[model samples]
Target chain A: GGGEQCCTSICSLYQLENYCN
Target chain B: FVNQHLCGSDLVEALYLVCGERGFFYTKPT
Candidate 1:
């Protein structure tokens, strides 16, 4: 469903940048 | 205001408000 809790926008920037690495 | 073109696009468009503008822009050049 659309309620995926891990998809929150407030996730850490470092975590986000790490994802693309 | 005339030439109050701070962050102007007189110069861009589709700005994402990455850190400012609260998402506002000088023009919509698509």
Candidate 2:
């Protein structure tokens, strides 16, 4: 999906006290 | 641009990263 829905999982994974340094 | 380094690794792979995968680091038209 071009919506980058795949990236959602990626974003969810990025959630670990890691607020986009 | 560079991001979380995957903690680990995209296409060709020219894309974006979500820090710790916690954000939607995407692109849009201005």
Candidate 3:
């Protein structure tokens, strides 16, 4: 329960990708 | 302090996204 790095990074990228896409 | 640091880091990033460079009003101000 302490590996949200990937989750947050992916989530941030995912959001940024869609945010500016 | 570990969780706080971790979450705080992300929180800062998110805040930057909305309050830092390129963030909301970041380009609207003079």
Candidate 4:
């Protein structure tokens, strides 16, 4: 499946989330 | 594409180059 969008507008750029992990 | 080559953590880093401008270096958690 395709990865979810990082459209939450905020991200760790490090921690694991819906998009980047 | 950025999403194709720069996927995963790499994509996040690339995003910094773009998203960083919009104050995206930090997070509020999900």
Cα error of candidate 1 at position B29, Å: 31
CAPRI band for model 3: incorrect
Candidate 3 residue A15 Cα shift, in angstroms, is 18
Judged by whole-model lDDT over C-alpha atoms, candidate 3 comes out at 0.35
Candidate 2 achieves a global lDDT of: 0.33
Write the residue-wise lDDT of candidate 1 on B1-30 in tens digits.
122221222112112322143333232331
- Higher DockQ: candidate 3 or 4? 4
- Whichever of 1 and 4 has more TM-score, that candidate is 4
Candidate 4: give the TM-score of chain A: 0.18
User: What ranges in model 4 sit over 4 Å off?
Assistant: A1-21, B1-4, B25-30
lDDT of 2 by residue, B1-30 (tens): 324222222420223333434433434311
Best-to-worst ranking by lDDT: 4, 3, 2, 1
Work out how many backbone clashes candidate 1 has. 0
Expressed as tens digits, the lDDT of each residue in B1-30 for candidate 4 is 222344346555655555544445434322
> Residue B27, candidate 2: how far off, in angstroms?
25
Q: Write the per-residue lDDT of candidate 1 for residues A1-21, one digit (tens) a residue.
A: 232222333333332233231
* i-RMS, each model, one decimal: 15.5, 11.1, 10.2, 9.5
TM-scores for every predicted model: 0.22, 0.16, 0.26, 0.35
Model 1, position B14: C-alpha lDDT score: 14
Tens-digit lDDT track for model 3 on B1-30?
112222344543544554444443112211
